[PDB]
């Protein structure tokens, strides 16, 4: 009866560790996502493969995983739209990302290309930075007729991330993009965007912001996306700022934990039992557990805020960073999907189904399960 | 370093409601797993799309659904040998087979095939028994050399079903399956067994007491399945009979619960803390403590009992029973997978991790957990 749909660049990962050399020998920038040619991806990876350096391989995409972690935490389905090559060879990377993919995570809306889906190549450097190395192939050839008008019309969010606007110049991927925007705001379905690293926002950030204005509900980011692009370093300020173009922002902070900030309506917040935690918006937490509303069903809006440290109290060690915020998206896609179908089950139009600072909590365990398992995808769920 | 191995007939279930005239058009009888022709199957499924009958398609098939729950419960390596389309469109039921199957049972193994997979219709009658129509497709046509040696020299065990052995003459799975046990007896693999429907046993018990004793380390079978097999009408002892021939017995009894029986070194046996129980043997589950062992490496074998009630105390409902009895061997299964990383990771050797009693506990809670859903395939872990 409920369910979440999102667009994503069909994505395979394929993971090495590597030399600062190899970085440089083909044009790369640690911490970067970067689009490559084709005779880069395939020298590329012939090294990898010549040198038996690729540690792993599994479904990727920011989306692909945000959708995969969703149905994986809420035994529910998630819908996925994207391409998937026409012809599947077994043993090929479309077979693979078939199989690795969450069994709940509806593939029978991808559209049939004529060409390999993407490959991720995911370079861990000496130094422990992690470089993105994109070879498309067709993965930006969805076109907006392949967008289902029911799919969205009954979907409790569409998530999207920026990486849908990188493309090359006449690729149908961004107008697909904005066909479904368009039916969401045709049946009231919030859209939810993620940023996609914080050199690629920094090309733009007030074409973003206005993108936020005009289209989006929800806003994921971490810490440097975030600076990049609100020009706030500290993450309470950044998703305050933000709060100006969406109703809800989750701003993700490494060690320091998360920040939620959304809107409620004066008359149903809820004051927390917390102690009150000092920063540059003082008291900050003091309705923390007050549920989401959407600004536009507020009648008097009161801007509210959470923030909770991670679950891993002290310097427990992390198996692998990769991940662990799109994880904390995907606990918040669960919250408020779980909260469509309590409506449906059945005063104020809610967002959330629990408080910011429920939410918070939930997010914050998504995230540490991911920091504690090499790949960005969850295989079960929570204990 | 861990992993288990399975041999299956791909099989994509279509499930289905139907009438009493329905099962009797299409030359079926209830209860039973039976083989129809292509003229058939394509009637019968014709007809359940014109009356949209349809309920749900998942991936199915005795060996693919145990892989697949193993997979779920232990968030482990899980190989399956079978066949599947060399060539895969989108939506097919090869495509739908891919995307349903959990993400770490690992299916680049499977052999090409230049014909469709397998179909199990699932027909629910008026009457509340399930019956199965199986359109074979190529789904028998694994052949031995398509056994990689490797897989299953560092497997945990080497699980099959008895309909291995159900096909069209001339067809190479039979022989495909003797490759794997042969392989698994040079490098002393557990080869499991899991018995497919009263009936099917019925038509030869003696020849499958023989296999068993020829070549089965592990037996699986409900009540009935192992009265077809020993004679014995009461579940105890026709699972004492069993261990004339193979080393560990799991047989479920539905409402009463389910037993295992097997062999322990006699210096090594543990008692039970628990009331000892009357049964057609005195005091049955006085060793329930004790872990299992293969015969071979006992030099004073005991047999040793447990039995354990249902998880659910009381009529409590039933969603669906489809697969509970396969779901206690996953969990058997990942108790056996856990006692081979433990030894890696380092006396007498054992063949189980736990206790008889333990593993009859949590075989016990897998069962509910695929008695609460209609799918024989859990698409979560247990809390
Ligand atoms: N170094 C760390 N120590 C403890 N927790 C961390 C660390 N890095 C990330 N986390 C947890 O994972 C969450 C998301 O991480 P973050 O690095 O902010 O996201 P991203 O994956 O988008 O870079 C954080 O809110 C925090 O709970
Ligand atoms: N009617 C029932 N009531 C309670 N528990 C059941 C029932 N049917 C099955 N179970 C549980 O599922 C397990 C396996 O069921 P069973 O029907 O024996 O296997 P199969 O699926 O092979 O027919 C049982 O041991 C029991 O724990
Ligand atoms: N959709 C998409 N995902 C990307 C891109 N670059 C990196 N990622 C993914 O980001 C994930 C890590 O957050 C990996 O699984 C990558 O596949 C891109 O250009 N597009
Ligand atoms: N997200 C958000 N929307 C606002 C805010 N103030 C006004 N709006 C809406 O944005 C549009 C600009 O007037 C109108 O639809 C307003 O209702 C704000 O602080 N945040
Ligand atoms: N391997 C195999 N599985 C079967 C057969 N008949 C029924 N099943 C499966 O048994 C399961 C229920 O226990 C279903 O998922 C069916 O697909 C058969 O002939 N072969
Ligand atoms: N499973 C099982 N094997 C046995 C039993 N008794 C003997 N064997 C073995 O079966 C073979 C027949 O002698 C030999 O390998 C014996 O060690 C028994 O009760 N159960
Ligand atoms: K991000
Ligand atoms: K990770
Ligand atoms: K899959
Ligand atoms: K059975
Ligand atoms: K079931
Ligand atoms: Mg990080
Ligand atoms: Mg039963």
Same mark, same amino acid.
């Given at each position: ?6 667009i ?5 990962d &394929? ?9 440089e020998?083909?044009?790369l ?6 689009? &490559? ?7 590329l ?8 350096l ?6 990727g995409?920011?989306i ?5 972690? %969703? $149905? ?9 739209l ?9 043993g090929?990377?479309?077979?693979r990302?078939?199989? *690795? ?6 593939? *029978? !809306? ?12 995911? =370079?861990?450097?000496?130094? @422990? ?12 050839q ?5 967008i289902?008008e029911?799919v &969205?019309? @009954?979907?409790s969010?569409?998530? =999207? ?5 990188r ?15 368009? !039916? ?7 859209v939810?965007?993620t940023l996609?690293?914080? +050199? ?10 206005? +993108? ?18 609100? @020009? ?6 950044? $998703? ?7 109703? =809800? ?13 959304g809107?409620?309506?004066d ?7 917390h ?10 937490? #003091? !309705?923390? +557990?007050?549920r989401?509303?959407?600004?536009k069903?507020? #009648? *008097? ?8 440290a991670?679950?891993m ?13 799109? @994880?904390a ?6 919250? &408020?999907?779980?909260?469509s179908?309590?409506?449906?089950n ?11 600072? #429920?939410?918070?909590? !939930?997010?914050?365990r998504?995230? %540490? ?15």
């Amino acid at each position: 009866a409920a369910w979440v749909v999102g667009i994503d660049q069909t994505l395979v990962d &394929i993971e090495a560790k590597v030399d600062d050399e190899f970085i440089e020998r083909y044009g790369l920038s640690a911490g970067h996502s970067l689009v &490559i040619e084709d005779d880069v991806a395939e020298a590329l990876y012939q090294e990898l493969k010549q040198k038996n350096l690729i540690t792993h391989q599994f479904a990727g995409g920011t989306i692909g995983n945000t959708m995969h972690n %969703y $149905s994986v935490l809420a035994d529910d389905r998630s819908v996925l739209l994207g391409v998937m090559c026409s012809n599947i060879e077994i043993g090929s990377y479309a077979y693979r990302y078939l199989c *690795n993919t969450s069994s709940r995570t509806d593939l *029978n !809306y991808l559209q049939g290309v004529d060409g390999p889906i993407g490959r991720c190549f995911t =370079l861990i450097g000496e130094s @422990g930075e992690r470089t993105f190395a994109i070879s498309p192939g067709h993965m930006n050839q969805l076109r907006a007729e392949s967008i289902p008008e029911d799919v &969205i019309a @009954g979907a409790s969010a569409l998530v =999207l991330t920026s990486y849908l606007v990188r493309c090359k110049p006449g690729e149908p991927m961004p107008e697909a993009t904005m066909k479904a925007i368009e !039916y969401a705001k045709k049946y009231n379905v919030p859209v939810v965007l993620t940023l996609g690293t914080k +050199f690629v926002i920094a090309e733009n950030p007030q074409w973003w912001q206005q +993108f936020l204005k005009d289209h989006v509900s929800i806003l994921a980011m971490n810490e440097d996306e975030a600076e990049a692009l609100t @020009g706030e370093s500290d993450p309470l300020l950044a $998703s305050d700022k933000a709060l100006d173009w969406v109703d =809800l922002v989750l701003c993700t902070a490494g060690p320091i934990g998360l920040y939620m900030a959304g809107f409620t309506e004066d008359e149903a917040k809820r004051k927390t039992q917390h102690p009150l935690l000092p920063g540059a918006i003082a008291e900050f937490n #003091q !309705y923390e +557990f007050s549920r989401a509303m959407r600004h536009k069903d507020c #009648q *008097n809006p009161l801007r509210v805020y959470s923030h909770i440290a991670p679950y891993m109290g002290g310097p427990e060690k992390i198996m692998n960073t990769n991940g662990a915020g799109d @994880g904390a998206l995907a606990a918040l896609l669960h919250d &408020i999907t779980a909260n469509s179908y309590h409506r449906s089950n059945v005063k104020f139009t809610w967002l959330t189904y629990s408080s910011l600072a #429920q939410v918070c909590k !939930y997010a914050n365990r998504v995230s %540490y399960q991911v920091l504690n398992q090499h790949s960005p995808r969850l295989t079960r769920g929570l204990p």
